[PDB]
Design a protein around this motif. Structure first.
Motif, short mmCIF file in Angstrom:
data_model
loop_
_atom_site.label_atom_id
_atom_site.label_comp_id
_atom_site.label_asym_id
_atom_site.label_seq_id
_atom_site.Cartn_x
_atom_site.Cartn_y
_atom_site.Cartn_z
N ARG A 1 0.81 -1.21 0.00
CA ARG A 1 0.00 0.00 0.00
C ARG A 1 0.85 1.27 0.00
NH1 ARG A 1 -5.03 -0.27 4.16
NH2 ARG A 1 -6.35 -1.79 3.07
N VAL B 1 1.88 3.68 -3.03
CA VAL B 1 1.13 4.79 -3.63
C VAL B 1 1.71 6.13 -3.20
CG1 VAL B 1 -0.74 4.96 -1.86
CG2 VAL B 1 -1.20 5.58 -4.24
N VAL B 2 2.26 6.22 -1.98
CA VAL B 2 2.94 7.45 -1.56
C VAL B 2 4.32 7.55 -2.21
CG1 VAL B 2 2.02 8.59 0.44
CG2 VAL B 2 2.56 6.30 0.64
N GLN B 3 5.04 6.44 -2.32
CA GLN B 3 6.36 6.44 -2.95
C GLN B 3 6.42 5.30 -3.95
OE1 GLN B 3 6.14 5.85 0.43
NE2 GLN B 3 6.77 7.76 1.43
N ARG C 1 -1.19 0.95 -12.37
CA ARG C 1 -0.67 1.55 -13.62
C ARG C 1 0.70 2.21 -13.45
NH1 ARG C 1 -0.82 6.21 -14.90
NH2 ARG C 1 -1.55 7.97 -13.64
N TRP D 1 6.74 0.68 7.74
CA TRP D 1 6.02 1.37 6.64
C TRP D 1 5.49 2.69 7.18
CZ3 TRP D 1 7.73 -0.68 2.66
CH2 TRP D 1 7.82 -2.06 2.48
N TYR D 2 4.92 2.67 8.39
CA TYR D 2 4.32 3.94 8.89
C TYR D 2 5.41 5.00 9.04
CZ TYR D 2 0.12 1.13 9.65
OH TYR D 2 -0.96 0.31 9.49
N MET E 1 8.33 5.23 7.43
CA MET E 1 8.80 5.65 6.08
C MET E 1 7.80 6.66 5.53
SD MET E 1 10.65 2.71 3.95
CE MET E 1 9.20 2.78 2.89
N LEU E 2 6.51 6.43 5.75
CA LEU E 2 5.46 7.37 5.27
C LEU E 2 5.54 8.66 6.10
CD1 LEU E 2 3.15 8.24 3.82
CD2 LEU E 2 3.20 5.78 3.42
N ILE F 1 -6.16 -0.56 -5.84
CA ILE F 1 -6.49 0.57 -6.76
C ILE F 1 -5.77 0.30 -8.09
CG2 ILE F 1 -4.72 2.36 -6.35
CD1 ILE F 1 -8.56 2.52 -6.85
N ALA G 1 -3.26 5.26 -10.52
CA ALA G 1 -2.31 6.04 -9.69
C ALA G 1 -2.63 7.53 -9.86
CB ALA G 1 -0.90 5.72 -10.09
N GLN G 2 -3.64 7.86 -10.66
CA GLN G 2 -4.08 9.27 -10.82
C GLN G 2 -5.26 9.49 -9.88
OE1 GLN G 2 -6.53 11.57 -12.59
NE2 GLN G 2 -5.04 13.05 -11.82
N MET H 1 -6.69 7.94 -6.83
CA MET H 1 -6.44 6.91 -5.79
C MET H 1 -7.16 7.27 -4.49
SD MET H 1 -3.92 9.31 -6.10
CE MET H 1 -2.14 9.52 -6.10
N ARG I 1 -7.63 5.18 -2.08
CA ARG I 1 -6.68 4.56 -1.12
C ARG I 1 -5.33 5.25 -1.30
NH1 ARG I 1 -9.71 3.21 0.68
NH2 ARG I 1 -11.50 4.01 -0.49
N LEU I 2 -4.92 6.06 -0.32
CA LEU I 2 -3.67 6.85 -0.48
C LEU I 2 -2.89 6.86 0.83
CD1 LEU I 2 -4.00 10.22 -2.44
CD2 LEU I 2 -1.98 8.77 -2.22
N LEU I 3 -2.10 7.92 1.06
CA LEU I 3 -1.33 8.10 2.31
C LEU I 3 -2.29 8.06 3.49
CD1 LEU I 3 0.93 11.30 2.52
CD2 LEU I 3 -0.14 10.39 4.56
N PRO J 1 -4.23 3.72 8.07
CA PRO J 1 -4.70 2.32 7.89
C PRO J 1 -4.33 1.52 9.14
#
Lengths: 403, 133, 92, 77
Positions: free
Chosen positions: A198, A201-203, A245, C9-10, C12-13, C66, C69-70, C72, C74-76, C79
């Motif tokens: 998931r 999508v951010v990176q 994509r 992951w959290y 890194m985000l 998803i 990627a344009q 989305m 479901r994003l940052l 979760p």
């Protein structure tokens, strides 16, 4: 937002300390908009001694300097060290708060321990910044889960697959694939993998997605652990590296294409080992791939992923799920052989889709056609798929000779 | 976050019914086997139990050709025939487990009694070819 | 959750709170070759298995994926996990 | 009964103290063996026998700059 005043019922209580029995509500409104007007004029003039005498605290000597300014008599006894105490009295219907003052024997103030004598104001010089940053002198500011064993194992194994070096990654994947007791840490690995896919999508990191797909491929090869309960976070992650994509940061040079066929082989394995008629895993995966492929407006990357998964699923899924939409190749070659718009990215993805399509449809053409195949290419779309089919028949003959 | 336990999608009776029908369909007594076959061919609520019947058939023939046990096979083929003529249940979501069973009942190496068992295995052959179509 | 499994992951985000669609084609009989299915004495173990997962049978995890990627939804996001253990063998 | 009987029973839980002790013991032993083999393979290693890395790998002894901090201090508190 609004003009805030003292309550009108607080003036009926005050008027009965005076002896006034009945005070009408228009008089109580007349009292409280005046006393709350004079509070705001000493609230804002105490703030002028808090600001000009630089304090930011509003001590009680600021209000006493403002009552002195408005000519009103001072309030005696508010410089002693006190606080805000209140004492509730319940009573038989009369609710109030009071002070509950206390007493002290007079000889226990004559014989109190005296505080220490104050010091006089003196000056001190020190450097705050010396042609740049501050010096480090002391006058400046200073600048039901997992046991520890398996918590440490989880930490080391997950941080070995983030990309510091390749050898520790290979040993971590050979640990995941070949250890007997990794249950009780399977939900943590499934959560880690699904959230990490998931976080693409951010990176849009292709490399970390390849590492997570090799983590899933290592989790599948473990004979001891059963992923039947914890594949609900694996299949999605696998197919995110298929029908998405943007798999790349630089779309033109990154080979998102391999994370496509690797994850397609992975999902064919995940629906070979786990599809049961109660599950309906394979039928529900083919239906998502199919309605992503037949539907127009889909990008060439996601169509590549759909064709790759459908063609990795099995021969039936390239013959009765891919072969009939072969006229779509003409719609592809509309944008390949022909078009001034050449310097876009819609050409590399289109001829990648073309190469995958004719590579996978060459044995399907070798299965359901004559052995001659004289002008099958001409009968085929664009005459290229047919050349690939002739090459496939030649390869099959070579394999038979080797046998 | 401790959570509640799940339940099997079959009732405690339905599961007892499945156990009785499968232990009757292995043909210890003809009366039991016959009544069980009739129930398999007429039960309207025999859907939602059909994965467990298809798996019992398929798995059985494959570990029942390891030793060529003809009755075990003749009873399973009669169970397949009793599954097919039931009009209520939807069968073509389960023939990926049925055709292979009838296949090995027709095209495998059967090295038992040369003439005597040929008669017995030819009755299983007849059953297999009919249920195949 | 932030500090649970997937904390890496959290961090890194940086989030800190706390024809072809025809259903017959997909019939398993029309997608499986029976000759390969049979072991045929050449060189399973599921049926009375205890239970199945809700997600593995009804949950469409494919829908969660998803494809754009344009666009989305479901994003940052955090979760955050609900830390709910089950399966079996797990102490409690 | 099949015509109209629906009985929702639960799932028999494991109360066997013997097999629960055995499961927790073997899972702890296996995870600590996997952890120590992974840490001995991805670092400097020693060996009681000549050229013995596959069987019985030892994590190599590294010196600390301040050894009382890693000795005397408690880690779970």
């Amino acid at each position: 937002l609004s003009n805030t005043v003292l309550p009108s019922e607080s003036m009926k209580v005050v008027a009965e300390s005076m002896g006034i029995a009945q005070i009408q509500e228009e008089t109580c409104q007349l009292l409280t908009d005046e006393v709350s007007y004079r509070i705001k004029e000493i609230a804002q003039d105490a703030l002028k001694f808090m600001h000009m005498g630089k304090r930011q605290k509003l001590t009680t000597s600021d209000i006493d300097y403002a009552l002195k300014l408005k000519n009103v008599e001072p309030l005696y006894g508010f410089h002693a060290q006190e606080f805000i105490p209140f004492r509730f009295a319940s009573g038989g219907g009369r609710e109030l708060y009071f002070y509950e003052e206390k007493e002290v024997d007079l000889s226990d103030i004559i014989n109190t321990p005296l505080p220490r004598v104050p010091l006089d104001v003196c000056l001190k010089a020190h450097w705050l910044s010396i042609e740049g940053c501050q010096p480090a002198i002391p006058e400046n500011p200073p600048p039901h889960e997992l046991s520890v064993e398996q918590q440490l194992y989880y930490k080391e194994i997950t941080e070995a697959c983030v990309g510091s070096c390749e050898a520790k990654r290979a040993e971590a994947l050979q640990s995941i694939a070949t250890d007997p007791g990794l249950y009780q840490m399977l939900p943590r690995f499934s959560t880690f993998i699904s959230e990490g896919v998931r976080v693409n999508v951010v990176q849009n990191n292709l490399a970390l997605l390849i590492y997570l797909m090799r983590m899933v491929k290592a989790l599948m090869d473990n004979p001891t652990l059963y992923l039947e309960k914890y594949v609900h976070e694996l299949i999605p992650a696998v197919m995110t590296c298929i029908v998405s994509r943007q798999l790349c940061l630089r779309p033109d040079v990154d080979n998102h294409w391999a994370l496509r066929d690797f994850a397609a082989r992975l999902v064919a394995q995940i629906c070979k080992h786990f599809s049961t008629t109660t599950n309906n895993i394979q039928s529900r995966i083919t239906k998502t791939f199919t309605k992503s492929w037949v539907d127009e407006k889909t990008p060439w990357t996601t169509r590549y992923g759909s064709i790759a998964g459908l063609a990795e699923l099995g021969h039936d899924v390239i013959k009765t799920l891919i072969l009939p939409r072969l006229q779509q190749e003409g719609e592809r070659i509309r944008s390949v052989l022909d078009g001034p718009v050449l310097s876009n990215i819609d050409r590399i993805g289109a001829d990648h889709v073309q190469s995958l399509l004719l590579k996978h449809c060459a044995p399907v053409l070798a299965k359901l056609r004559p052995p001659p195949d004289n002008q099958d290419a001409y009968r085929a779309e664009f005459g290229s798929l047919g050349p690939l089919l002739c090459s496939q028949v030649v390869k099959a003959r070579a394999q038979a000779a080797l046998q | 976050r401790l959570k509640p336990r799940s339940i099997h999608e079959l009732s405690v009776e339905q599961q007892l019914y499945y156990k009785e029908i499968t232990e009757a369909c292995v043909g210890s007594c003809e009366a039991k086997r016959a009544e069980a076959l009739q129930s398999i061919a007429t039960d309207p609520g025999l859907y939602q139990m059909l994965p467990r019947f298809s798996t019992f058939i398929s798995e059985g023939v494959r570990v029942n050709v390891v030793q060529n046990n003809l009755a075990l096979l003749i009873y399973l083929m009669r169970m397949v025939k009793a599954l097919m003529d039931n009009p209520t249940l939807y069968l073509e979501k389960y023939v990926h487990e049925l055709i292979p069973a009838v296949m090995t009942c027709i095209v495998s190496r059967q090295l038992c009694l040369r003439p005597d068992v040929d008669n017995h295995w030819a009755l299983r052959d007849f059953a297999a070819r009919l249920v195949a179509q | 959750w932030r500090y649970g499994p997937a904390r890496l992951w959290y961090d890194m985000l940086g989030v800190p709170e706390d024809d072809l669609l025809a259903d017959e084609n997909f019939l398993m009989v029309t997608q499986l070759h029976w000759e390969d299915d049979i072991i045929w004495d050449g060189e399973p173990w599921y049926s009375i298995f205890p239970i199945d997962n809700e997600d593995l049978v009804y949950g469409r995890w494919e829908d969660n994926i998803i494809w754009d990627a344009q666009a989305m939804p479901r994003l940052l996001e955090p979760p955050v996990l609900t830390l709910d253990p089950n399966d079996e063998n797990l102490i409690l | 009964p099949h015509t109209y009987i629906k009985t929702p029973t639960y799932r028999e839980p494991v109360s066997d103290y013997q097999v629960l002790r055995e499961k927790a013991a073997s899972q702890r032993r296996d995870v600590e063996r996997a952890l120590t083999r992974f840490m001995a393979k991805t670092g400097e290693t020693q060996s009681l026998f000549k050229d013995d890395v596959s069987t019985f790998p030892l994590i190599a002894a590294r010196p600390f700059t301040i050894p009382y901090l890693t000795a005397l201090l408690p880690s779970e508190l």
